[PDB]
Design an enzyme around this catalytic site. Structure first.
Site, PDB file in Angstrom:
ATOM      1  N   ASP A 194       0.861  -1.179   0.000  1.00 45.54           N
ATOM      2  CA  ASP A 194       0.000   0.000   0.000  1.00 45.54           C
ATOM      3  C   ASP A 194       0.894   1.224   0.000  1.00 45.54           C
ATOM      4  O   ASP A 194       2.051   1.161   0.450  1.00 45.54           O
ATOM      5  CB  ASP A 194      -0.911   0.032   1.218  1.00 45.54           C
ATOM      6  CG  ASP A 194      -0.117   0.177   2.511  1.00 45.54           C
ATOM      7  OD1 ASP A 194       0.475  -0.847   2.923  1.00 45.54           O
ATOM      8  OD2 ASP A 194      -0.071   1.297   3.066  1.00 45.54           O
ATOM      9  N   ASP A 196       1.058   5.432   1.097  1.00 42.25           N
ATOM     10  CA  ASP A 196       0.504   6.414   2.020  1.00 42.25           C
ATOM     11  C   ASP A 196       1.019   7.812   1.715  1.00 42.25           C
ATOM     12  O   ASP A 196       2.226   8.011   1.568  1.00 42.25           O
ATOM     13  CB  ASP A 196       0.864   6.038   3.459  1.00 42.25           C
ATOM     14  CG  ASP A 196       0.527   4.604   3.764  1.00 42.25           C
ATOM     15  OD1 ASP A 196      -0.676   4.266   3.612  1.00 42.25           O
ATOM     16  OD2 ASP A 196       1.444   3.837   4.106  1.00 42.25           O
ATOM     17  N   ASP A 251      -3.635   5.396   0.700  1.00 40.38           N
ATOM     18  CA  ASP A 251      -4.240   6.160   1.785  1.00 40.38           C
ATOM     19  C   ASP A 251      -3.858   7.615   1.607  1.00 40.38           C
ATOM     20  O   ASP A 251      -2.673   7.944   1.435  1.00 40.38           O
ATOM     21  CB  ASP A 251      -3.784   5.685   3.165  1.00 40.38           C
ATOM     22  CG  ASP A 251      -4.197   4.263   3.463  1.00 40.38           C
ATOM     23  OD1 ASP A 251      -5.198   3.813   2.893  1.00 40.38           O
ATOM     24  OD2 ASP A 251      -3.519   3.604   4.298  1.00 40.38           O
TER      25      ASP A 251
HETATM   26  O1  LIG Z   1       2.639  -1.505   6.819  1.00 47.96           O
HETATM   27  C1  LIG Z   1       2.313  -0.376   6.350  1.00 47.96           C
HETATM   28  O2  LIG Z   1       1.433  -0.235   5.421  1.00 47.96           O
HETATM   29  C2  LIG Z   1       3.073   0.839   6.768  1.00 47.96           C
HETATM   30  O3  LIG Z   1       3.799   0.903   7.838  1.00 47.96           O
HETATM   31  O4  LIG Z   1       2.985   1.811   5.972  1.00 47.96           O
HETATM   32 MN   LIG Z   2       1.435   1.752   4.449  1.00 42.69          MN
HETATM   33 MN   LIG Z   3      -1.757   2.509   3.929  1.00 42.83          MN
END
Ligand SMILES: O=C([O-])C(=O)[O-]
Ligand SMILES: [Mn+2]
Ligand SMILES: [Mn+2]
Ligand SMILES: [Cl-]
Ligand SMILES: [Mn+2]
Ligand SMILES: [Mn+2]
Ligand SMILES: [Mn+2]
Ligand SMILES: [Mn+2]
Ligand SMILES: [Mn+2]
Ligand code: NA
Length: 327
Positions: A194, A196, A251
């Site tokens: 993912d 962020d 995210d």
């Molecule tokens: O594990 C996750 O997604 C992080 O720490 O960003």
């Molecule tokens: Mn993450």
């Molecule tokens: Mn995330």
DNA sequence: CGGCATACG
DNA sequence: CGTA
DNA sequence: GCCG
């Protein structure tokens, strides 16, 4: 020698006790599947201690004095040192309960409590869930539809492409707003599951209302395969690939610049690092920490921070860059 | 023994 | 309940 | 499960 809190010691992404830490993390994960958050935390902390060591553990003697190593975790390590395998760990790995809870909780929209109920109902495979779709939330439907892509590692090349797209929408939504990569990629990971991003604006208050405007602009560009409908958005993005595309979890978070250092700290992780930092703050310093701020409950005041460095100083901790927060 | 981080969608 |  |  070794301090008791993970936020008091550097923990690099790669280290010298990988096999030992992985085994303890299996037991931590299994504890979480059974609702045992205390045992999960101890196994996570013991694993993290090994990640922070400067060289490989070769003998049981080397665990003496290390925090979070008692009878249980020390036995796991001794079996791995002596036989290359821990019987308890292997039993967990092989168990139908562990394998199914892992499969179900890895679905976006499915937590431990949902996975456990489904397990008790007799469900075991993703196709079992797909055969009864009326019993699923929209979020779970999206998580199941995209499960295969979401199980494929995200590369740093993907991240840079996604960041440019997010910046373009953010620039239309609010000129002057900035986009910062957080999470595991900011800690130096080369892959992840993912991506962020943390969004702010240098003029306090101008970021109010920003996330709806960003999401609408990404949606009209055809880039959003799933979103909820605010300051946090948990999306599935359409990411171009050679002659095709793949779904990626993204995210997006907005914070005012006054909160940005706290949000950056919290969203950069690791999860264990942040839980340990908040525990340390409250228990050792009497201060309450989250991703919005740092509160003194005796004077009833919030600490002003202009940087992560400020926050570590407030807490009396030596500064750790993100790449040493891999607890 | 109690505690185990602390938020938002 | 889910998400981080 | 471990700590204080
Ligand atoms: O594990 C996750 O997604 C992080 O720490 O960003
Ligand atoms: Mn993450
Ligand atoms: Mn995330
Ligand atoms: Cl427990
Ligand atoms: Mn035991
Ligand atoms: Mn033996
Ligand atoms: Mn807020
Ligand atoms: Mn107790
Ligand atoms: Mn116990
Ligand atoms: Na999940």
């Amino acid at each position: 020698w070794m301090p008791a809190y993970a936020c008091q010691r550097p923990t690099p992404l790669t280290h010298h006790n990988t096999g030992l830490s992985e085994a303890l993390e299996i037991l931590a994960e299994a504890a979480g599947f059974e609702g045992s958050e205390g045992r999960l935390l101890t196994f996570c902390r013991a694993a993290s201690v090994l990640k922070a060591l400067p060289s490989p553990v070769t003998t049981l003697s080397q665990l003496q004095g290390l925090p979070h190593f008692g009878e249980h975790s020390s036995r796991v390590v001794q079996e791995l040192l002596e036989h290359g395998v821990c019987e308890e760990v292997e039993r967990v790995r092989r168990s139908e309960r562990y394998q199914t809870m892992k499969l179900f909780t890895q679905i976006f929209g499915v937590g431990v409590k949902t996975a456990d109920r489904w397990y008790r109902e007799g469900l075991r495979t993703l196709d079992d869930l797909r055969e009864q779709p009326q019993k699923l939330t929209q979020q779970q439907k999206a998580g199941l539809q995209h499960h295969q892509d979401l199980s494929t590692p995200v590369l740093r090349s993907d991240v840079d492409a996604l960041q440019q797209v997010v910046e373009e929408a953010v620039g239309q939504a609010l000129p002057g707003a900035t986009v910062t990569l957080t999470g595991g990629f900011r800690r130096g990971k080369l892959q992840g599951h993912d991506v962020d991003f943390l969004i702010t604006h240098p003029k306090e208050g101008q970021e109010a209302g920003l996330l709806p405007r960003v999401m609408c602009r990404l949606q009209d560009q055809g880039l959003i395969l799933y979103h909820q409908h605010f300051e946090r958005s948990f999306c599935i993005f359409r990411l171009p690939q050679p002659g095709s595309w793949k779904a990626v979890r993204v995210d997006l978070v907005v914070a005012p610049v006054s909160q940005f250092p706290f949000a950056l700290l919290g969203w950069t992780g690791s999860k264990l690092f942040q839980r340990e930092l908040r525990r340390f703050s409250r228990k050792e310093k009497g201060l309450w920490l989250n991703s919005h701020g740092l509160f003194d409950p005796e004077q009833k005041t919030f600490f002003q921070a202009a940087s992560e460095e400020d926050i570590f100083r407030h807490l009396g901790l030596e500064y750790l860059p993100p790449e040493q927060r891999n607890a």
